[PDB]
């Protein structure tokens, strides 16, 4: 496949062109024209890049690439190491940020719901679906469940959360700021990846169970999902590598 | 003391005028004129408020108040309950954000340094001081040190940091975004309150020990220090109340 | 350093040659001659092996390697996957079994003692040290201490143990069979890693507190200290990786 | 019945003499010639023995008796108390080990298959049957079924096992070393009583669900079934006593 | 000692005369005047009486004797066999009920707290002391702790109890009716011997852990302690005998 | 149906006013007048009440209601929660105690006998029927059969009962005090729900097999049968709900 054909293929599968974002979606750094072996992971860290070079990948696809709004375009320190590892080896880098969080099937938000056992039912706002657990359980049990399914112990705050959690809303990664919107919609628990100082007061004062189950942990689902989608719908050789990040 | 007097007293001790901020610094909600019993804390949470009410406080002073830039001005949910507890009881709410982060004597950044045994020596950027531990220790020992001093286990990332940590930079609260700037300046360790997904790659790729010691935990120092200053320089009856927040 | 050189350095520090074993101690699978980066772990599993590859290790060092007496020589299944990862990448695999259980300073046994707060005072038999807890406590209290220090709830049988445990014998890993020898010597508790059906009768009928604290959990001690020893005594770059194992 | 007659009766029903074992099968300790009341249990522990004395038994029959190969012959400590209790009271001790594991009808392996709802279909190796659950289920439901049926929560490692378990191999007691042969055979799960450190690597790297269901827990079926068969086929009064053992 | 002397001596030690009871406390069935050898136990069942005869005792002392309020006076069945064994052999039968449950030193309630490691701190109601575990633990562990100290697995209902148990109330024997009084006083656990249908709802709806640890299991303590007290304070020969009872 | 009419219908089918009881039989807490949907169960616990609320029930009928003789009338803790749920939602509570144990067709005693396979042949006293198993069996087998039909392992004491059980007497619930009455009449076994310390002695000394099969497990039959009887003879929608209770 040509690198530009692959950009167009996933752009169309994820209705990318239609979504405003904090960074460029699609081909971020151009490499050789022909793409046959693909390495993907949550973030284009130096460590993922090093696996793509070790594996002889032609392209790398991630949910967090470079060139974020507000960033300095200067190329030094980390940025110089990353771009040189890509450019010298002719590796194509693609990033799909909000389109891969939102897709109904392959997105981070839909995959978390499948992994945690939540029946999606509607959407509170663009990146915040809500639904119900198919097996309603107490706040403590839900924490252990999230810990067993993502393999990471979440920050659980449920000082004033309901006795049993049924209705839930969530947003993967750094979606702590949607907690009020979810509490205002009416839920039993709100789940996200990161947490901030104010997030705790929102859970306490609004009567809900809150979980920060990890930015990286809650965001392996979509890129892994898109990687499967590529292996089943093309002849590409796509390998998804989960490189652990505590955050 | 009069409410407007107290405002001008603390505004001048913290050179507040000369500091751009994300929210109004000073008297945020006007209550009775005469102030004598003051309750303070890290954030004007409903819980700190109900303590002010139980203690028959005339004013509450915090580091995190209301009216953050970009916030919806409508008064509903939590803002209604909070503002009603203050206006109905004639309690003055005062808040100081960045000026209480930076003051060289009473600020959260100077009080963390005192607490962890760091000799301040310069400033990399306005909210980010640098200095040297008085007793250099290996990354593991500094993590245990931070946890004993703050009473909270920090997230520590030292995959690629020096054998012994001597030079340190820091920013209390959510200053994770200052990590690359500390890296370019040159430090063995960077400490702040919260953590983001990109912060972990900044720690590994630039070879430094990183600690996320908690937003609330790294921010009890300054408003506690200011409360002492008030009890020591005025006849005001000030009680600092620490309400645990895991974030 | 030269792979054969690193083999002689550790053999001599651990007095390996003078100790008969169930498997070869030293370089078990040869790789590239020049070793500078090493990854270590309790067991040369496929998981550790994959982390060694990913981090560009030239050698892997473990407490449990391959070629155990009685095992079939044929290379198939897990053996084939494991040997290939090592051989295709020129990675040296070394292992030290009994020699790393027993070394007075760096061994598994002496390191468990320091972690648990036991003053070593002697040995009942070659892999069975004896000593006393610096702070004597009841059986139940000791169970929570071992759980807190090792990060794993131990199986505790104390149906007939003394009211306070002071004198203790122990043997990391699969040493449940040394319990009768410990009882005849005279101790209040026996601690090991695994448990067997007969172990519980031994505990009960001989009046001691028995603890099965984890084969893996009790054997991260030696390999991690041996890794600290190499970083402090050579210029090799050694990283210990703990890959959790329930047993 | 005459003590030696009962020996011969059970030796024949179980085809004992044709199975090489690690300890003597049959009458291990002679007692009064005339047998009428018999107490049975998993292991000839001091507790079962004291029970047989209290009930006035003339014999005891167990799965685990004495005299294992390589054990010291000397009679001291536990052996002295156990042998004294039997000899002073003229109580006959019988033990059948591998024969009582294997009998197609009354054996521990067949009894466990019946308890867990597994249709026996063949034999992988002598002590390791295989079959299919009459009701296939995911690995978590099976952990719960085993825990419900055995009365003990098993250790369940299934991080890489199939979504639904149907084909199963098992060996009661200490059969962990048989897991690799079951993998080669091709099964979705392997169940045994104990666990060892290498067993967890075998489950993960070969993709199967593994369960250490308890050594004593998985071995009550056989001696209990034998006890039932004697009450149905002789005029003997045989009682089975389950004396709890968590291993 | 004269039988009437021994009665007077235990009455005063236990402050018996000043306690209303459901049966006569003291000498219930008179026998020979001179008492030298005494056998004791929880209940004057036929099995106990029979040991008294075999052992040639002059007297038997229990916690549960005869003549309970409400009982038929007619002497037939069990009562005839029991009374014949005592009268024909001239054996004295003494029984102390509530006095032996309540004595602060020798009573069933004080002996259970010492067996279980509880520091007695006061009394909720006449037969229900309250106290704190010197080693607080979760409800599951306390269950295992009760099992091991008593030698019998208790029924543990802890669906809604606290995460850690510290304050506890108890009443040996059939004291399940006191669970609501304990819940009203404020406790993390209530322990007794028997259980009733309603006892479970009290536990669940009042948020405490409940344990039915055995009527007989929890009442060996008092009569055994009075037995050691007689042996230490007189020249009598008293043997306490535990005859197992499941309830 | 009108609430006072339903009361009447069941009072007459169970000949209730004729039976004197420990609590009022019939409508115990009046609710809305029109009843159409009804939830039933063994005891009016908070848990059944909350189900009745979830399900929109107009009435709840149980075997155990409130207002037992001797109980305090005050409404607090548990009674307040329960009564508030009923009264605030206008749910009628009806309860029938002894008339629901005794009815020849629908009662707990007759329904247990149909379940267990016993032909009822007459009665010893009011709540204690007697009969014979259609298939006589040893007491061990009877234990296993009771466990299979009721779903709970019973306590079986058969130390001294007949080799085979044929004639049986039984009382569901707390009927242990009837065991001496069954023995004098002449039976092989006596079956009830709960057990008490003295019941074990009655069993041993009177030579009968005794089974405590569970107060809750033996009392589902009646209210379940009454609920079917209401669905078949009225237009009411009745749902019997089993809320497990181990006692
Ligand atoms: Mg995202
Ligand atoms: Mg801040
Ligand atoms: Mg700040
Ligand atoms: Mg080992
Ligand atoms: Mg070892
Ligand atoms: Mg075995
Ligand atoms: Mg076996
Ligand atoms: Mg009693
Ligand atoms: Mg009592
Ligand atoms: Mg009843
Ligand atoms: Mg009843």
mmCIF file with all atom_site columns, N, CA, C and O in Angstrom, chain F residues 1-7 27 30-38 56-60 89-92 94 235-237:
data_model
loop_
_atom_site.group_PDB
_atom_site.id
_atom_site.type_symbol
_atom_site.label_atom_id
_atom_site.label_alt_id
_atom_site.label_comp_id
_atom_site.label_asym_id
_atom_site.label_entity_id
_atom_site.label_seq_id
_atom_site.pdbx_PDB_ins_code
_atom_site.Cartn_x
_atom_site.Cartn_y
_atom_site.Cartn_z
_atom_site.occupancy
_atom_site.B_iso_or_equiv
_atom_site.pdbx_formal_charge
_atom_site.auth_seq_id
_atom_site.auth_comp_id
_atom_site.auth_asym_id
_atom_site.auth_atom_id
_atom_site.pdbx_PDB_model_num
ATOM 1   N N  . UNK F 1 1   ? -57.509 -6.716  43.339 1.00 0.00 ? 1   UNK F N  1
ATOM 2   C CA . UNK F 1 1   ? -58.292 -7.125  44.545 1.00 0.00 ? 1   UNK F CA 1
ATOM 3   C C  . UNK F 1 1   ? -58.116 -6.096  45.644 1.00 0.00 ? 1   UNK F C  1
ATOM 4   O O  . UNK F 1 1   ? -57.047 -5.457  45.724 1.00 0.00 ? 1   UNK F O  1
ATOM 5   N N  . UNK F 1 2   ? -59.148 -5.937  46.484 1.00 0.00 ? 2   UNK F N  1
ATOM 6   C CA . UNK F 1 2   ? -59.095 -4.995  47.606 1.00 0.00 ? 2   UNK F CA 1
ATOM 7   C C  . UNK F 1 2   ? -58.193 -5.585  48.713 1.00 0.00 ? 2   UNK F C  1
ATOM 8   O O  . UNK F 1 2   ? -58.294 -6.808  49.053 1.00 0.00 ? 2   UNK F O  1
ATOM 9   N N  . UNK F 1 3   ? -57.335 -4.759  49.318 1.00 0.00 ? 3   UNK F N  1
ATOM 10  C CA . UNK F 1 3   ? -56.440 -5.327  50.331 1.00 0.00 ? 3   UNK F CA 1
ATOM 11  C C  . UNK F 1 3   ? -57.100 -6.083  51.467 1.00 0.00 ? 3   UNK F C  1
ATOM 12  O O  . UNK F 1 3   ? -56.534 -7.107  51.913 1.00 0.00 ? 3   UNK F O  1
ATOM 13  N N  . UNK F 1 4   ? -58.271 -5.653  51.938 1.00 0.00 ? 4   UNK F N  1
ATOM 14  C CA . UNK F 1 4   ? -58.901 -6.395  53.041 1.00 0.00 ? 4   UNK F CA 1
ATOM 15  C C  . UNK F 1 4   ? -59.546 -7.693  52.533 1.00 0.00 ? 4   UNK F C  1
ATOM 16  O O  . UNK F 1 4   ? -59.840 -8.655  53.297 1.00 0.00 ? 4   UNK F O  1
ATOM 17  N N  . UNK F 1 5   ? -59.778 -7.729  51.227 1.00 0.00 ? 5   UNK F N  1
ATOM 18  C CA . UNK F 1 5   ? -60.375 -8.935  50.626 1.00 0.00 ? 5   UNK F CA 1
ATOM 19  C C  . UNK F 1 5   ? -59.327 -10.018 50.519 1.00 0.00 ? 5   UNK F C  1
ATOM 20  O O  . UNK F 1 5   ? -59.622 -11.165 50.790 1.00 0.00 ? 5   UNK F O  1
ATOM 21  N N  . UNK F 1 6   ? -58.125 -9.658  50.050 1.00 0.00 ? 6   UNK F N  1
ATOM 22  C CA . UNK F 1 6   ? -57.015 -10.633 49.923 1.00 0.00 ? 6   UNK F CA 1
ATOM 23  C C  . UNK F 1 6   ? -56.760 -11.255 51.295 1.00 0.00 ? 6   UNK F C  1
ATOM 24  O O  . UNK F 1 6   ? -56.650 -12.450 51.442 1.00 0.00 ? 6   UNK F O  1
ATOM 25  N N  . UNK F 1 7   ? -56.691 -10.417 52.314 1.00 0.00 ? 7   UNK F N  1
ATOM 26  C CA . UNK F 1 7   ? -56.480 -10.889 53.674 1.00 0.00 ? 7   UNK F CA 1
ATOM 27  C C  . UNK F 1 7   ? -57.493 -11.981 53.957 1.00 0.00 ? 7   UNK F C  1
ATOM 28  O O  . UNK F 1 7   ? -57.151 -13.081 54.413 1.00 0.00 ? 7   UNK F O  1
ATOM 29  N N  . UNK F 1 27  ? -52.876 -8.887  57.543 1.00 0.00 ? 27  UNK F N  1
ATOM 30  C CA . UNK F 1 27  ? -52.358 -7.588  57.074 1.00 0.00 ? 27  UNK F CA 1
ATOM 31  C C  . UNK F 1 27  ? -51.753 -6.980  58.273 1.00 0.00 ? 27  UNK F C  1
ATOM 32  O O  . UNK F 1 27  ? -52.461 -6.696  59.239 1.00 0.00 ? 27  UNK F O  1
ATOM 33  N N  . UNK F 1 30  ? -50.973 -1.719  56.851 1.00 0.00 ? 30  UNK F N  1
ATOM 34  C CA . UNK F 1 30  ? -51.883 -1.414  55.751 1.00 0.00 ? 30  UNK F CA 1
ATOM 35  C C  . UNK F 1 30  ? -51.246 -0.502  54.687 1.00 0.00 ? 30  UNK F C  1
ATOM 36  O O  . UNK F 1 30  ? -50.435 0.369   55.048 1.00 0.00 ? 30  UNK F O  1
ATOM 37  N N  . UNK F 1 31  ? -51.598 -0.713  53.400 1.00 0.00 ? 31  UNK F N  1
ATOM 38  C CA . UNK F 1 31  ? -51.070 0.098   52.304 1.00 0.00 ? 31  UNK F CA 1
ATOM 39  C C  . UNK F 1 31  ? -52.231 0.541   51.391 1.00 0.00 ? 31  UNK F C  1
ATOM 40  O O  . UNK F 1 31  ? -53.347 0.696   51.862 1.00 0.00 ? 31  UNK F O  1
ATOM 41  N N  . UNK F 1 32  ? -51.990 0.743   50.097 1.00 0.00 ? 32  UNK F N  1
ATOM 42  C CA . UNK F 1 32  ? -53.046 1.220   49.208 1.00 0.00 ? 32  UNK F CA 1
ATOM 43  C C  . UNK F 1 32  ? -54.136 0.131   49.192 1.00 0.00 ? 32  UNK F C  1
ATOM 44  O O  . UNK F 1 32  ? -53.862 -1.031  49.489 1.00 0.00 ? 32  UNK F O  1
ATOM 45  N N  . UNK F 1 33  ? -55.376 0.499   48.890 1.00 0.00 ? 33  UNK F N  1
ATOM 46  C CA . UNK F 1 33  ? -56.474 -0.459  48.879 1.00 0.00 ? 33  UNK F CA 1
ATOM 47  C C  . UNK F 1 33  ? -56.518 -1.465  47.702 1.00 0.00 ? 33  UNK F C  1
ATOM 48  O O  . UNK F 1 33  ? -56.971 -2.599  47.856 1.00 0.00 ? 33  UNK F O  1
ATOM 49  N N  . UNK F 1 34  ? -56.063 -1.064  46.517 1.00 0.00 ? 34  UNK F N  1
ATOM 50  C CA . UNK F 1 34  ? -56.113 -1.944  45.364 1.00 0.00 ? 34  UNK F CA 1
ATOM 51  C C  . UNK F 1 34  ? -54.782 -2.636  45.215 1.00 0.00 ? 34  UNK F C  1
ATOM 52  O O  . UNK F 1 34  ? -53.776 -1.951  44.980 1.00 0.00 ? 34  UNK F O  1
ATOM 53  N N  . UNK F 1 35  ? -54.789 -3.972  45.335 1.00 0.00 ? 35  UNK F N  1
ATOM 54  C CA . UNK F 1 35  ? -53.581 -4.779  45.221 1.00 0.00 ? 35  UNK F CA 1
ATOM 55  C C  . UNK F 1 35  ? -53.694 -5.562  43.949 1.00 0.00 ? 35  UNK F C  1
ATOM 56  O O  . UNK F 1 35  ? -54.710 -6.168  43.678 1.00 0.00 ? 35  UNK F O  1
ATOM 57  N N  . UNK F 1 36  ? -52.640 -5.607  43.186 1.00 0.00 ? 36  UNK F N  1
ATOM 58  C CA . UNK F 1 36  ? -52.714 -6.337  41.956 1.00 0.00 ? 36  UNK F CA 1
ATOM 59  C C  . UNK F 1 36  ? -51.386 -7.065  41.833 1.00 0.00 ? 36  UNK F C  1
ATOM 60  O O  . UNK F 1 36  ? -51.360 -8.242  41.423 1.00 0.00 ? 36  UNK F O  1
ATOM 61  N N  . UNK F 1 37  ? -50.274 -6.379  42.158 1.00 0.00 ? 37  UNK F N  1
ATOM 62  C CA . UNK F 1 37  ? -48.898 -6.969  42.047 1.00 0.00 ? 37  UNK F CA 1
ATOM 63  C C  . UNK F 1 37  ? -48.322 -7.213  43.438 1.00 0.00 ? 37  UNK F C  1
ATOM 64  O O  . UNK F 1 37  ? -48.373 -6.371  44.334 1.00 0.00 ? 37  UNK F O  1
ATOM 65  N N  . UNK F 1 38  ? -47.755 -8.394  43.604 1.00 0.00 ? 38  UNK F N  1
ATOM 66  C CA . UNK F 1 38  ? -47.351 -8.883  44.902 1.00 0.00 ? 38  UNK F CA 1
ATOM 67  C C  . UNK F 1 38  ? -46.083 -9.623  44.816 1.00 0.00 ? 38  UNK F C  1
ATOM 68  O O  . UNK F 1 38  ? -45.897 -10.465 43.906 1.00 0.00 ? 38  UNK F O  1
ATOM 69  N N  . UNK F 1 56  ? -42.365 -2.392  41.742 1.00 0.00 ? 56  UNK F N  1
ATOM 70  C CA . UNK F 1 56  ? -43.702 -1.776  41.702 1.00 0.00 ? 56  UNK F CA 1
ATOM 71  C C  . UNK F 1 56  ? -44.833 -2.575  42.340 1.00 0.00 ? 56  UNK F C  1
ATOM 72  O O  . UNK F 1 56  ? -46.040 -2.453  42.005 1.00 0.00 ? 56  UNK F O  1
ATOM 73  N N  . UNK F 1 57  ? -44.463 -3.362  43.338 1.00 0.00 ? 57  UNK F N  1
ATOM 74  C CA . UNK F 1 57  ? -45.463 -4.177  44.003 1.00 0.00 ? 57  UNK F CA 1
ATOM 75  C C  . UNK F 1 57  ? -46.508 -3.410  44.791 1.00 0.00 ? 57  UNK F C  1
ATOM 76  O O  . UNK F 1 57  ? -46.252 -2.320  45.282 1.00 0.00 ? 57  UNK F O  1
ATOM 77  N N  . UNK F 1 58  ? -47.706 -3.969  44.926 1.00 0.00 ? 58  UNK F N  1
ATOM 78  C CA . UNK F 1 58  ? -48.687 -3.290  45.719 1.00 0.00 ? 58  UNK F CA 1
ATOM 79  C C  . UNK F 1 58  ? -48.758 -3.927  47.114 1.00 0.00 ? 58  UNK F C  1
ATOM 80  O O  . UNK F 1 58  ? -49.359 -3.332  48.047 1.00 0.00 ? 58  UNK F O  1
ATOM 81  N N  . UNK F 1 59  ? -48.167 -5.112  47.285 1.00 0.00 ? 59  UNK F N  1
ATOM 82  C CA . UNK F 1 59  ? -48.220 -5.817  48.564 1.00 0.00 ? 59  UNK F CA 1
ATOM 83  C C  . UNK F 1 59  ? -47.068 -6.803  48.656 1.00 0.00 ? 59  UNK F C  1
ATOM 84  O O  . UNK F 1 59  ? -46.486 -7.178  47.638 1.00 0.00 ? 59  UNK F O  1
ATOM 85  N N  . UNK F 1 60  ? -46.689 -7.184  49.868 1.00 0.00 ? 60  UNK F N  1
ATOM 86  C CA . UNK F 1 60  ? -45.616 -8.156  50.040 1.00 0.00 ? 60  UNK F CA 1
ATOM 87  C C  . UNK F 1 60  ? -46.252 -9.184  51.012 1.00 0.00 ? 60  UNK F C  1
ATOM 88  O O  . UNK F 1 60  ? -46.957 -8.782  51.937 1.00 0.00 ? 60  UNK F O  1
ATOM 89  N N  . UNK F 1 89  ? -44.348 4.104   50.310 1.00 0.00 ? 89  UNK F N  1
ATOM 90  C CA . UNK F 1 89  ? -44.677 3.611   48.998 1.00 0.00 ? 89  UNK F CA 1
ATOM 91  C C  . UNK F 1 89  ? -46.057 2.969   48.926 1.00 0.00 ? 89  UNK F C  1
ATOM 92  O O  . UNK F 1 89  ? -46.415 2.434   47.870 1.00 0.00 ? 89  UNK F O  1
ATOM 93  N N  . UNK F 1 90  ? -46.809 3.006   50.046 1.00 0.00 ? 90  UNK F N  1
ATOM 94  C CA . UNK F 1 90  ? -48.155 2.459   50.087 1.00 0.00 ? 90  UNK F CA 1
ATOM 95  C C  . UNK F 1 90  ? -48.256 0.980   49.803 1.00 0.00 ? 90  UNK F C  1
ATOM 96  O O  . UNK F 1 90  ? -49.280 0.533   49.268 1.00 0.00 ? 90  UNK F O  1
ATOM 97  N N  . UNK F 1 91  ? -47.225 0.229   50.219 1.00 0.00 ? 91  UNK F N  1
ATOM 98  C CA . UNK F 1 91  ? -47.179 -1.234  50.050 1.00 0.00 ? 91  UNK F CA 1
ATOM 99  C C  . UNK F 1 91  ? -47.762 -1.925  51.320 1.00 0.00 ? 91  UNK F C  1
ATOM 100 O O  . UNK F 1 91  ? -47.392 -1.591  52.479 1.00 0.00 ? 91  UNK F O  1
ATOM 101 N N  . UNK F 1 92  ? -48.732 -2.810  51.096 1.00 0.00 ? 92  UNK F N  1
ATOM 102 C CA . UNK F 1 92  ? -49.355 -3.612  52.141 1.00 0.00 ? 92  UNK F CA 1
ATOM 103 C C  . UNK F 1 92  ? -48.369 -4.738  52.527 1.00 0.00 ? 92  UNK F C  1
ATOM 104 O O  . UNK F 1 92  ? -47.818 -5.368  51.618 1.00 0.00 ? 92  UNK F O  1
ATOM 105 N N  . UNK F 1 94  ? -48.305 -8.365  54.539 1.00 0.00 ? 94  UNK F N  1
ATOM 106 C CA . UNK F 1 94  ? -49.098 -9.391  55.147 1.00 0.00 ? 94  UNK F CA 1
ATOM 107 C C  . UNK F 1 94  ? -48.122 -10.450 55.599 1.00 0.00 ? 94  UNK F C  1
ATOM 108 O O  . UNK F 1 94  ? -47.068 -10.705 54.950 1.00 0.00 ? 94  UNK F O  1
ATOM 109 N N  . UNK F 1 235 ? -56.392 -13.257 39.734 1.00 0.00 ? 235 UNK F N  1
ATOM 110 C CA . UNK F 1 235 ? -55.788 -12.559 38.600 1.00 0.00 ? 235 UNK F CA 1
ATOM 111 C C  . UNK F 1 235 ? -54.625 -11.756 39.085 1.00 0.00 ? 235 UNK F C  1
ATOM 112 O O  . UNK F 1 235 ? -54.063 -10.932 38.338 1.00 0.00 ? 235 UNK F O  1
ATOM 113 N N  . UNK F 1 236 ? -54.233 -11.990 40.327 1.00 0.00 ? 236 UNK F N  1
ATOM 114 C CA . UNK F 1 236 ? -53.104 -11.243 40.867 1.00 0.00 ? 236 UNK F CA 1
ATOM 115 C C  . UNK F 1 236 ? -51.776 -11.672 40.206 1.00 0.00 ? 236 UNK F C  1
ATOM 116 O O  . UNK F 1 236 ? -51.645 -12.844 39.780 1.00 0.00 ? 236 UNK F O  1
ATOM 117 N N  . UNK F 1 237 ? -50.793 -10.757 40.070 1.00 0.00 ? 237 UNK F N  1
ATOM 118 C CA . UNK F 1 237 ? -49.492 -11.180 39.515 1.00 0.00 ? 237 UNK F CA 1
ATOM 119 C C  . UNK F 1 237 ? -48.546 -11.290 40.745 1.00 0.00 ? 237 UNK F C  1
ATOM 120 O O  . UNK F 1 237 ? -48.065 -10.270 41.286 1.00 0.00 ? 237 UNK F O  1
#
